[PDB]
Amino acid sequence: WTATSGSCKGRCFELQEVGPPDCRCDNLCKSYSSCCHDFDELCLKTARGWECTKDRCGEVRNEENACHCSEDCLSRGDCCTNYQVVCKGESHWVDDDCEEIKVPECPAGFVRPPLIIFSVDGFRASYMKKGSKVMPNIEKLRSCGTHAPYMRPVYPTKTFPNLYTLATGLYPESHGIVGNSMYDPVFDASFHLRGREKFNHRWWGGQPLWITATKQGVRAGTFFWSVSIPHERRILTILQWLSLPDNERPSVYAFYSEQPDFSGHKYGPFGPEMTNPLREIDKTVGQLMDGLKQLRLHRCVNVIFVGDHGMEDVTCDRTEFLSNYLTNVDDITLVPGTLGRIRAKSINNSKYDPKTIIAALTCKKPDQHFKPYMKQHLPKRLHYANNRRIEDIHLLVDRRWHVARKPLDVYKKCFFQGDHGFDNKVNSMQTVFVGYGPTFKYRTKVPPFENIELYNVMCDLLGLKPAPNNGTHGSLNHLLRTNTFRPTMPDEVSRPNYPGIMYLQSEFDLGCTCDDKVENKLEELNKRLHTKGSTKERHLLYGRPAVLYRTSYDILYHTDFESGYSEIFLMPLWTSYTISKQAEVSSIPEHLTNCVRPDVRVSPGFSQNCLAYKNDKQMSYGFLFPPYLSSSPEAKYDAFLVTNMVPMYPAFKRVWAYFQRVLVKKYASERNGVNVISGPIFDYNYDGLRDTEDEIKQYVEGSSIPVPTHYYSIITSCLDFTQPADKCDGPLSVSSFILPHRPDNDESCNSSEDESKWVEELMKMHTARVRDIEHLTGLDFYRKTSRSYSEILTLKTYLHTYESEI
Ligand SMILES: *[C@@H]1O[C@H](CO)[C@@H](O[C@@H]2O[C@H](CO)[C@@H](O[C@@H]3O[C@H](CO[C@H]4O[C@H](CO)[C@@H](O)[C@H](O[C@H]5O[C@H](CO)[C@@H](O)[C@H](O)[C@@H]5O[C@H]5O[C@H](CO)[C@@H](O)[C@H](O)[C@@H]5O)[C@@H]4O)[C@@H](O)[C@H](O[C@H]4O[C@H](CO)[C@@H](O)[C@H](O)[C@@H]4O[C@H]4O[C@H](CO)[C@@H](O)[C@H](O)[C@@H]4O)[C@@H]3O)[C@H](O)[C@H]2NC(C)=O)[C@H](O)[C@H]1NC(C)=O
Numbered sequence: 001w002t003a004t005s006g007s008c009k010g011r012c013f014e015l016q017e018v019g020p021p022d023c024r025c026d027n028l029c030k031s032y033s034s035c036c037h038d039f040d041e042l043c044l045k046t047a048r049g050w051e052c053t054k055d056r057c058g059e060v061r062n063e064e065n066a067c068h069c070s071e072d073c074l075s076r077g078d079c080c081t082n083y084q085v086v087c088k089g090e091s092h093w094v095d096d097d098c099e100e101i102k103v104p105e106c107p108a109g110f111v112r113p114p115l116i117i118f119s120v121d122g123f124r125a126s127y128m129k130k131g132s133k134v135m136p137n138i139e140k141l142r143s144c145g146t147h148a149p150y151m152r153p154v155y156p157t158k159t160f161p162n163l164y165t166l167a168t169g170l171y172p173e174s175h176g177i178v179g180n181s182m183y184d185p186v187f188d189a190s191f192h193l194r195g196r197e198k199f200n201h202r203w204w205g206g207q208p209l210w211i212t213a214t215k216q217g218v219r220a221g222t223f224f225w226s227v228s229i230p231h232e233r234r235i236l237t238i239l240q241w242l243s244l245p246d247n248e249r250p251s252v253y254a255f256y257s258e259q260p261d262f263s264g265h266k267y268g269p270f271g272p273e274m275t276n277p278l279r280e281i282d283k284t285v286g287q288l289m290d291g292l293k294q295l296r297l298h299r300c301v302n303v304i305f306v307g308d309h310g311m312e313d314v315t316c317d318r319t320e321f322l323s324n325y326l327t328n329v330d331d332i333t334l335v336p337g338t339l340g341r342i343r344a345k346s347i348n349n350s351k352y353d354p355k356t357i358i359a360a361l362t363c364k365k366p367d368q369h370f371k372p373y374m375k376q377h378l379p380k381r382l383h384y385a386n387n388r389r390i391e392d393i394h395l396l397v398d399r400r401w402h403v404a405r406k407p408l409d410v411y412k413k414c415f416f417q418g419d420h421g422f423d424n425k426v427n428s429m430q431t432v433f434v435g436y437g438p439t440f441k442y443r444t445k446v447p448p449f450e451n452i453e454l455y456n457v458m459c460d461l462l463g464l465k466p467a468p469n470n471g472t473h474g475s476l477n478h479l480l481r482t483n484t485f486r487p488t489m490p491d492e493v494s495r496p497n498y499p500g501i502m503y504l505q506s507e508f509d510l511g512c513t514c515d516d517k518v519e520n521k522l523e524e525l526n527k528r529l530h531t532k533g534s535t536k537e538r539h540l541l542y543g544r545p546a547v548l549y550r551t552s553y554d555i556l557y558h559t560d561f562e563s564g565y566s567e568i569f570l571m572p573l574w575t576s577y578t579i580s581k582q583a584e585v586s587s588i589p590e591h592l593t594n595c596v597r598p599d600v601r602v603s604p605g606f607s608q609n610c611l612a613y614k615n616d617k618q619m620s621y622g623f624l625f626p627p628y629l630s631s632s633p634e635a636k637y638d639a640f641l642v643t644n645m646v647p648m649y650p651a652f653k654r655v656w657a658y659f660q661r662v663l664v665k666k667y668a669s670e671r672n673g674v675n676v677i678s679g680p681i682f683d684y685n686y687d688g689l690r691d692t693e694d695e696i697k698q699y700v701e702g703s704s705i706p707v708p709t710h711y712y713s714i715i716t717s718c719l720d721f722t723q724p725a726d727k728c729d730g731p732l733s734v735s736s737f738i739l740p741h742r743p744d745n746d747e748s749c750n751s752s753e754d755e756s757k758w759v760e761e762l763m764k765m766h767t768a769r770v771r772d773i774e775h776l777t778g779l780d781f782y783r784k785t786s787r788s789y790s791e792i793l794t795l796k797t798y799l800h801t802y803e804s805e806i
């Protein structure tokens with residue numbers, strides 16, 4: 001109930017909410033069916049429009065007008081945004097040359113530069129260049145402020161997940177808004193676009209910027225606006241809030257445009273009907289900046305112009321129907337569109353089987369435009385698994401396509417020409433970032449980054465301490481003139497042991513054999529030095545990774561590679577080696593095909609054994625440092641140590657072998673040497689975080705050899721490729737992957753063909769940030785470089801995406 005009999009007189013766009021049954025006058029009352037009877041009349045005036053005309057100047061104040069051109073309007077804080085231009089001979093903000101804002105220039109009483117978050121729905125990254133002629137205001141912000149060529153949204157590239165990620169710095173899986181539509185089995189409730197359930201606080205996890213601000217004593221404008229409140233009125237409301245007395249006035253504001261998303265859906269990303277919405281958004285920005293200039297705030301306020309995702313061409317004729325694949329199409333519930341999520345229609349159906357559903361959707365048609373996954377098998381970079389609202393079965397839909405259950409659903413529920421939601425690496429889904437103000441840099445271009453990073457920065461801009469989030473704080477310092485956050489390296493938790501030769505060959509009973517009994521103080525002093533780490537400055541370029549958790553492990557040195565060998569997991573946590581441009585690929589000699597050698601520095605009890613692999617009919621093994629890249633026939637013996645060995649399904653050995661024999665060399669050629677760090681990842685609960693040993697669900701049969709869910713590699717070289725990887729004087733260049741360790745290659749529909757037609761495509765799909773590997777291993781890389789820590793944090797958040805140019 002709401003007793004809508006109260007009045008909004010003096011309460012228009014009040015900042016604190018009132019609880020029913022008192023009627024409301026805040027910018028969300030419409031949405032709650034709760035405004036006072038007189039809201040429209042007092043708060044939503046329209047009389048005479050939004051602009052001063054020549055014959056309104058000096059007018060007698062008339063309260064019925066949407067905005068005023070009267071002489072007392074500046075003091076009352078309610079002039080039309082163009083007042084000074086029409087009536088006081090002023091120029092528009094867009095006509096003024098930009099001049100660096102070296103320090104905030106604010107009125108007395110302003111404790112901090114305010115922040116205005118101007119968010120635009122569906123604003124595709126390429127609009128910055130392609131629409132540039134019709135967006136003079138936005139282009140001024142862009143070229144005079146700090147901008148990125150594009151910003152990477154989170155997956156799914158939908159509205160609520162992205163807007164709430166902007167607000168919290170969290171992945172949807174952590175914030176809980178995992179789509180525009182959800183079922184929560186624990187609540188037994190559904191979240192929809194239309195309806196009252198989405199208003200319930202229980203959907204919304206983490207801590208959005210407005211709450212963070214409020215708790216730390218920074219006052220926040222109410223972020224949201226009911227759809228019917230026109231853009232011009234939202235702008236005038238923010239500007240009014242900005243005239244409030246010091247003690248009442250918020251420091252952080254939000255504006256949201258439904259455009260250009262709304263039109264994009266109807267007309268496609270580049271439909272000729274798209275020019276007008278872009279003009280209109282530019283006009284709104286024009287008004288904001290003109291209104292800031294009026295109040296002397298245009299060199300005080302930090303402005304963020306930010307989109308949530310792009311927009312792609314998508315028509316009804318590009319729809320895949322699950323009814324062309326499943327016989328049982330009525331036993332399932334599908335969340336449809338640009339992603340698919342499937343669950344059983346009924347919990348009381350024990351004949352429902354996800355395994356047979358996936359198989360029925362796997363590589364069934366030649367140009368099939370989606371790919372089924374169990375959620376834990378999705379590329380780790382999407383971070384889309386660790387929430388009970390995300391269904392076990394997911395469909396990654398090709399760009400430009402939809403997935404639906406039955407044809408009836410499409411024609412009884414073509415209209416649309418645009419949609420979004422696809423993989424967050426897709427170019428058409430990329431969106432925009434611009435920061436403009438005293439705290440942002442002047443005329444600075446920064447590299448693409450992910451929207452999860454912004455929460456931290458907005459906290460920095462307001463002097464706030466961010467709640468724990470998925471950003472890497474300091475990784476965006478290069479956007480800021482001041483307010484940078486100076487992080488320190490996490491402290492190493494476990495120090496390594498440096499074992500010497502401690503065991504005799506005969507103490508080992510591992511069922512391994514090697515034809516290594518083929519036998520000089522010249523070459524014996526040499527190999528001693530190698531085992532003590534003589535070549536370590538070659539193979540370990542950035543220092544050893546720090547172990548950030550309590551464990552027991554050994555550093556092992558070799559001519560060609562160095563490892564951190566875990567006595568707990570019986571394999572290295574990491575293996576580091578450098579391949580120079582000149583390096584030579586060689587084969588495993590015939591006599592050594594099945595060679596595994598005990599490591600006389602590591603006890604039998606902390607070693608794997610060959611018997612368990614023999615007995616395990618499903619599981620074979622591979623090596624972290626590849627035998628193919630051994631620097632000499634004698635050095636090759638090192639690569640067969642039981643301590644370089646890791647469990648691999650024969651299916652995955654196909655991927656691994658090709659990576660080690662063909663791809664490392666190719667990258668070394670193209671990048672002028674590469675440093676490689678490779679290792680296992682255990683993420684059995686798919687939380688993105690290193691599993692503890694009691695979380696492992698699979699061992700090589702008969703043993704305590706744990707089976708990785710994934711294998712990673714981090715591939716570093718010199719950004720200036722005229723310098724060899726091992727002699728780099730400046731910034732680095734990185735790409736990484738986290739390959740799922742699967743018993744089949746069902747993921748790649750081409751896998752019965754030669755590795756050269758599918759392996760690299762799969763690796764690219766599973767591209768990763770070094771930071772993703774950090775979370776998954778509890779390791780901290782790049783500890784010893786000559787680079788600043790902020791620059792290294794940026795490097796660690798880099799994602800190599802393999803999309804062409806935007
Ligand atoms: C990205 O960033 C985020 C944010 O930093 C990272 O997420 C954090 O990771 C931590 C480790 O997983 C986790 O810490 C746990 O907290 C548990 C209680 O937490 C509550 O309070 C916090 C703080 O206010 C709150 O944020 C939480 O909110 C979650 O849940 C609510 C309600 O369901 C949601 O609305 C909200 O969206 C959020 O959901 C997400 O997180 C939860 C995990 O908490 C997931 O289950 C969801 O799917 C969703 O993704 C909570 O309200 C606490 O119970 C844990 O403590 C257990 O384990 C520790 C080990 O140290 C041990 O000391 C304790 O004994 C305890 O064990 C007991 O419970 C076990 C399991 O039930 C049981 O086996 C035992 O026998 C014991 O009984 C733990 O400390 C932290 O909550 C989240 N925070 C967020 C916001 O998600 C995330 O990891 C980052 N991602 C990457 C890739 O880096």
Ligand SMILES: O=C(c1cnc(OCC(F)(F)F)c(C2CC2)c1)N1C[C@@H]2[C@H](C1)[C@H]1CN(C(=O)c3ccc4[nH]nnc4c3)C[C@@H]21
Binds near residue numbers: 162261
């Ligand atoms: O009011 C906020 C808000 C505005 N700003 C916000 O945050 C700004 C900030 F991130 F900067 F903080 C947030 C936060 C998510 C809560 C919400 N809104 C109002 C609209 C839009 C965001 C939501 C999504 N809706 C839709 O109808 C919709 C829109 C486009 C679509 N394309 N395809 N399907 C679509 C469905 C309903 C809601």
Ligand SMILES: [Ca+2]
Binds near residue numbers: 121159261308
């Ligand atoms: Ca959107």
Ligand SMILES: [Ca+2]
Binds near residue numbers: 685687688690692
């Ligand atoms: Ca885990």
Ligand SMILES: [Cl-]
Binds near residue numbers: 158178179180181335
């Ligand atoms: Cl969704």
Ligand code: NA
Binds near residue numbers: 615
């Ligand atoms: Na085997």
Ligand code: NA
Binds near residue numbers: 745748750751752
């Ligand atoms: Na296959």
Ligand SMILES: [Zn+2]
Binds near residue numbers: 122159261262265420
């Ligand atoms: Zn949309």
